[PDB]
Design a protein around this ligand. Structure first.
Ligand SMILES: Nc1nc2c(ncn2[C@@H]2O[C@H](COP(=O)(O)OP(=O)(O)OP(=O)(O)O)[C@@H](O)[C@H]2O)c(=O)[nH]1
Ligand SMILES: [Mg+2]
Lengths: 443, 48, 96, 81, 73, 97, 77, 102, 73, 80
């Protein structure tokens, strides 16, 4: 939805991967905006793609080709079009505001299009600092938001494959302003590394609904007759979070310093004398480092392009699967002999409004600059063969919002910006190699 | 030279209490919908 | 530690490793731990003498590892600075 | 602790017997609390193999069998904490 | 019925004559009087029964913890 | 619709699950002595939510700017309304150039 | 262990408990001195084998030595 | 002492460390240090060492002086080598047997 | 400190264990420890010749476990 | 319907209570095996055995009485 914090989520990763960037003076960084109009209205209007390398919970580095989208109602072009060439949807829902109308629309369209969904409950810190809810009522609010999302999912397809809940690792609790985004498993691991050897998955699966921890028997009860125990999630996650926030805010230098020393987090003496919000950001960045929970959830619950080739071909492609081009799409072959099949769903302005960059996902084959390709329109078919236009490929770039990486060539499964082939494209188009077998089809 | 200050939490709280008649009570910024600077620039340009 | 970070990086690729026996294993790495316990798929075991066998799923204990031949294109993997308390080499933004 | 005795002595020539039987002879640069020894301008003689000189070399702590120490060190003072 | 843990078992055996067996076929017979937590032991007037035959006498003995295989009698 | 909820599925698997460690901040409480005032300051107007600044000059502090930057109070005489409007006009002209 | 850091990016030959020898460029080490060697050659008794990127365990390593140096004002009045 | 519980902090660990010498088997090292008795060493490579012992570590790391080291191995031929001073890592020690000086 | 190995997917499945010294044991995995100590039920041992003996319930020390193998598709 | 996981320490505790005779293997001695009734263990499973007998490949059983077996050598624990 609008202003629920989806650009702040990407700014969270940009702060870590790009050390040069610094937060602005009076507002948020809002990386992946890159339009003077959007900087004026302080809201995203265009869907700027961003490719960056992020780190997994264990240390592995992936290559996230994330696409940022507007949250305004009228700009659902920049959600529907880029989603057709993506493998999943990361849904950012404000906990305070809850599920809104655009969130409902996004959920309906994603489930209608067989899109895995990863839920990020943003602006958690507003429960602690603004709404001032007690931890138990905060847990109830989080649970209600998750249940609303699950209801919106169930209104389309009652399949259990699309079900978001923290115990499945499908939901991340985040505060992108303070700079943290954890999961059950990530926070559980952050316990395990400190306190010895216990399986992270077993510990993490017992940190949700009405599972109570008994502080004397050290066991997970089920109902906690009378007041024997307190809820596991609240006992192990929300209360430590509340106490962290309050220690930073409430001006307790010695107590906070001692507690951070226990965690081997060491601050310069001039750091405790900071403004409350930068001090919160510093503490949260030292305590919760890179947002590895979000990366781990995305990698686990969103299929890789090779795994998603079959589903993409079944949904988007309209031609016969048994054909050679259909087989090439299914295998997502990268060799030069393979046919080149790419889908262009967007056109992006250059810095000066002179030429357009075509945003394409290479479904199969390989592409090099200077290549001759044949562009297929929206209604190209055997009846209408006149929508074909032969064009060259001037320049291939990997998008990074505020800059581009120029590559001599690209391979299958990559999202790239193509320069030099935009005149024949209105709205969407399919690009195929000219030296190719007969009967090409369009997406 | 008296160029930078750092105040405690009780001191800032007490100063906020004392000068309570001379500071706004909005903390929202949505109150100035069409009554902020850019809207005034647009109105001046359009002569409305 | 950077070495176990690279070992974790390898998961999903094809890695060859030899144990204290002298047998070399050629398969796809699917899991790895700080102890360097490894899970493998489609292994082609070459014995010390030279006999070649095949395996499907194994869980090699870390303590019985001599070395591994990681795929070459992981030479450019980033070696992050590790603070005192951090147990995983990750990009940092705080003090250290 | 006694490994401190190792670091308190430095830059003297010492022959070293490794774990496998190899003999190395050279002057130490720095040793560790953890028994990692660093050697410079040494004479590496692998068991049954021809001697070969190298400019520097380091040994893991578990591979040290024993030390051939010189006769020019005040050991009684050297042992004091 | 009553389980006896290793350390109580051996400390309830101080001063008795025992046959300790090394990892590599050497058995030493003698009496022990003091042990620390790492289960390395000291003997008195001990003799080596190599291949089960009495060869020589060593006197008092200290064995490192890792060399031993079992202790008995 | 789930046949068995994940809750009983999680508990039923090893019902004797044991973790020895305590939560992180256990000796503390979610609210300290100065937490309420700190929260009050956190969402205060600009000068009073900082705790660190740069000592502006004595004449660089307007002290009543927010009175006419906001709307005029209702039921005021014409001259007061015009005064509000003229001061706002001067501020806008200053900000424009 | 500060001296050990000085060996980064140097070319190293490492004798192993097996008795072999790996030669190559050091990328990163460990607290247990697990070594990461880039462009690694194997010295099996001498036989040459290309290995590539190799992670040696700490136990496997016996000794190591260097073989090469690491690859490498405004104005006035 | 009544602290073999093995769950201790640093000062009581050091007390237990010193008691591990003052009455444990490693006590043989102290009276060998103070009485300057002959001590024979059995290494894990079938080596025979006899020498004065001067200092020892809890790991049985030992500094030796005036060492007579013999090894046997053609036909079995025993040979000897006397070296001035030794630092022997307690890792490779199998056995110690004292020859009383008196 | 230490870390629990990931063996939940291997539980209650027919497995092959390779111990040190060219040993080999069948069985159904039933439990594991931090140090990879494993527990097997109704297991079967292989000898060098190749004949299988019923070996029974087994509690292997994790120090000696070389590999753990499943055979299913 | 599934069966719960039994950790090795609890398994050996069950053997201790049931007084089930065992056949302990060794770290590298393939031929040498030990049998007897278990009597105690610790967190390192240094095992205290009763009526220990040293069985070899040709069943050369030798009585050893009650002995303490260092955990560094146990490769396997048998249930009868
Ligand atoms: N308190 C708090 N505010 C946040 C947090 N995350 C984002 N914000 C604020 O949310 C507002 C909008 O942030 P954006 O990143 O632009 O949200 P957006 O979804 O990209 O907005 P659109 O692109 O127009 O949909 C800004 O005021 C941010 O400072 C948070 O975690 N806590
Ligand atoms: Mg946005």
């Amino acid at each position: 939805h609008l202003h629920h914090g989806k650009s702040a989520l990407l700014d969270l990763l940009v702060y870590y991967t790009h050390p040069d960037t610094k937060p602005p003076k009076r507002r948020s960084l809002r990386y992946t905006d890159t339009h003077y109009l959007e900087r004026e209205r302080v809201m995203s209007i265009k869907s700027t793609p961003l490719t960056l390398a992020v780190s997994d919970m264990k240390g592995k580095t992936f290559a996230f080709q994330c696409i940022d989208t507007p949250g305004h109602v009228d700009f659902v072009d920049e959600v529907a079009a880029p989603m057709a060439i993506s493998d999943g949807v990361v849904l950012v829902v404000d906990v305070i505001e809850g599920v809104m109308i655009n969130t409902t629309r996004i959920i309906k369209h994603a489930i209608l299009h067989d899109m895995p969904i990863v839920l990020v409950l943003n602006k958690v810190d507003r429960l602690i600092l603004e709404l001032r809810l007690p931890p138990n009522d905060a847990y109830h609010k989080l649970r209600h938001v998750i249940d609303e999302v699950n209801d919106n999912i169930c209104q389309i397809s009652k399949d259990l494959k699309y079900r978001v809940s923290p115990e499945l690792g499908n939901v991340c609790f985040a505060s992108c302003d303070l700079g943290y985004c954890f999961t059950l498993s990530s926070f559980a691991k952050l316990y395990i590394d400190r306190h010895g050897g216990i399986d992270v998955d077993l510990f993490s699966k017992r940190l949700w609904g009405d599972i109570y921890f008994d502080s004397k028997t050290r066991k997970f009860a089920k109902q906690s007759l009378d007041g024997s125990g307190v809820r596991s999630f609240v006992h192990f996650i929300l209360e430590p979070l509340y106490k962290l926030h309050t220690l930073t805010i409430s001006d307790e230098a010695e107590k906070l310093k001692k507690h951070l020393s226990s965690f081997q987090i060491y601050l310069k003496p001039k750091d405790y004398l900071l403004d409350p919000k930068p001090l919160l950001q510093l503490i949260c960045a030292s305590f919760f480092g890179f947002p590895v929970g979000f990366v781990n959830a995305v990698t686990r619950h969103i299929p890789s392009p090779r795994e998603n080739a079959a589903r993409k071909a079944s949904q988007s492609y309209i031609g016969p699967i048994n054909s050679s081009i259909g087989k090439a799409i299914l295998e997502m072959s990268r060799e030069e002999s393979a046919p080149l099949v790419m889908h262009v769903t967007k056109l992006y302005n250059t810095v000066d409004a002179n030429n357009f960059y075509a945003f394409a996902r290479v479904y199969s084959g390989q592409v090099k600059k200077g290549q001759k390709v044949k562009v297929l329109g929206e209604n190209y078919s055997l009846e209408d063969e006149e929508d074909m236009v032969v064009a060259h490929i001037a320049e291939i770039c990997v998008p990074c919002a505020r800059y581009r990486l120029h590559v001599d060539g690209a391979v299958a499964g990559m999202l790239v910006l193509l320069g030099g082939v935009d005149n024949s494209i209105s709205k969407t188009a399919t690009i195929v190699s000219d030296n190719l077998k007969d009967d090409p089809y369009i997406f | 030279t008296y160029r930078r200050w750092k105040l405690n939490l009780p001191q800032m709280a007490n100063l906020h209490r004392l000068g309570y008649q001379l500071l706004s009570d909005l903390r929202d910024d949505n109150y100035f919908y069409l009554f902020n600077d850019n809207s005034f620039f647009t109105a001046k340009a359009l002569n409305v | 530690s950077l070495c176990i970070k690279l070992l974790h990086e390898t998961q999903g690729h094809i890695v060859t490793m030899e144990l204290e026996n002298g047998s070399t294993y050629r398969g796809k790495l699917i899991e790895a731990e700080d102890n360097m316990n490894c899970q493998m798929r489609d292994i082609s075991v070459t014995a010390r003498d030279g006999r070649v066998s095949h395996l499907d799923q194994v869980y090699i204990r870390g303590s019985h590892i001599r070395f591994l031949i990681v795929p070459d294109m992981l030479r450019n993997a980033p070696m992050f600075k590790v603070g005192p308390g951090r147990s995983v080499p990750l990009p940092t933004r705080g003090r250290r | 602790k006694l490994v401190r005795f190792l670091m308190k002595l430095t830059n003297e020539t010492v022959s070293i017997e490794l774990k496998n039987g190899t003999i190395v002879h050279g002057t130490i640069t720095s040793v560790d609390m953890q028994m990692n020894t660093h050697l410079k301008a040494v004479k590496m003689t692998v068991k049954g193999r021809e001697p070969v000189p190298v400019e520097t070399l380091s040994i893991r702590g578990n591979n040290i069998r024993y030390y051939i120490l010189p006769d020019s060190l005040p050991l009684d003072t050297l042992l004091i904490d | 019925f009553v389980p006896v843990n290793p350390k109580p078992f051996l400390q309830g055996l101080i001063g008795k004559p025992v046959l300790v067996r090394l990892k590599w076929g050497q058995e030493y017979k003698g009496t022990l009087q003091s042990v620390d937590s790492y289960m390395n032991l000291q003997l008195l007037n001990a003799e080596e029964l190599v291949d089960g035959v009495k060869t020589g006498d060593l006197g008092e003995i200290l064995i490192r913890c890792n060399n031993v295989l079992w202790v008995g009698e | 619709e789930l046949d068995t909820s994940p809750e009983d599925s999680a508990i039923e698997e090893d019902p004797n699950f044991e973790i020895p460690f305590d939560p992180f901040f256990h000796s503390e409480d979610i609210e300290f002595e100065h937490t309420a005032s700190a929260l009050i300051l956190l969402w205060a107007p600009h000068p009073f939510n900082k705790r660190s600044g740069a000592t502006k000059r004595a004449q660089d502090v307007p002290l009543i700017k927010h009175w006419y930057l906001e709307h005029c109070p209702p039921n005021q005489p014409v001259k007061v309304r015009v005064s509000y409007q003229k001061l706002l006009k001067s501020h806008v002209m200053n900000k424009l150039h | 262990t500060t001296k050990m850091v000085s060996l980064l990016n140097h070319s190293l030959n490492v004798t192993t408990k097996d008795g072999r020898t790996f030669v190559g460029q050091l990328l990163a080490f460990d607290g247990f001195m697990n070594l990461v060697l880039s462009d690694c050659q194997e010295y099996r008794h001498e036989e040459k084998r290309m290995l590539g990127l190799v992670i040696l365990r700490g136990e496997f390593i016996v000794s190591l030595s260097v073989q090469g140096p690491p690859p490498m004002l405004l104005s006035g009045p | 002492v009544d602290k073999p519980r093995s769950e201790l902090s640093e000062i009581e660990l050091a007390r237990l460390e010193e008691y591990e010498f003052s009455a444990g088997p490693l006590s043989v090292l102290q009276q060998a240090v103070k009485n300057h008795d002959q001590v024979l060493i059995n290494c894990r490579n079938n080596k025979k060492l006899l020498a004065r012992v001067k200092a020892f570590d809890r790991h049985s790391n030992m500094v030796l002086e005036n060492v007579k080291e013999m090894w046997t191995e053609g036909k079995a031929i025993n040979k000897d080598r006397f070296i001035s001073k030794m630092f022997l890592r307690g890792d490779g020690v199998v056995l110690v047997v004292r020859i009383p000086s008196a | 400190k230490a870390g629990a190995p990931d063996l939940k997917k291997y539980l209650d499945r027919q497995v092959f264990v390779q111990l040190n010294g060219s040993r080999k044991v069948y069985g159904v995995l039933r439990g594991y420890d931090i140090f990879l100590n494993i527990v097997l039920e109704d297991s079967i041992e292989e000898k060098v010749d190749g004949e299988k003996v019923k070996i029974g319930s087994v509690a292997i020390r994790g120090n000696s476990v070389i590999m753990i193998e499943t055979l299913d598709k | 319907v599934q069966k719960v996981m039994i950790p090795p320490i609890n398994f050996i505790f069950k053997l201790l209570q049931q007084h089930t005779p065992v056949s302990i293997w060794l770290f590298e001695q393939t031929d040498i095996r030990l049998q007897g009734q278990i009597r105690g263990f610790d967190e390192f499973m240094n095992i205290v055995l009763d009526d220990a007998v040293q069985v070899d490949a040709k069943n050369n059983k030798r009585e050893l009485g009650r002995i303490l077996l260092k955990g560094d050598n146990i490769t396997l624990i048998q249930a009868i």
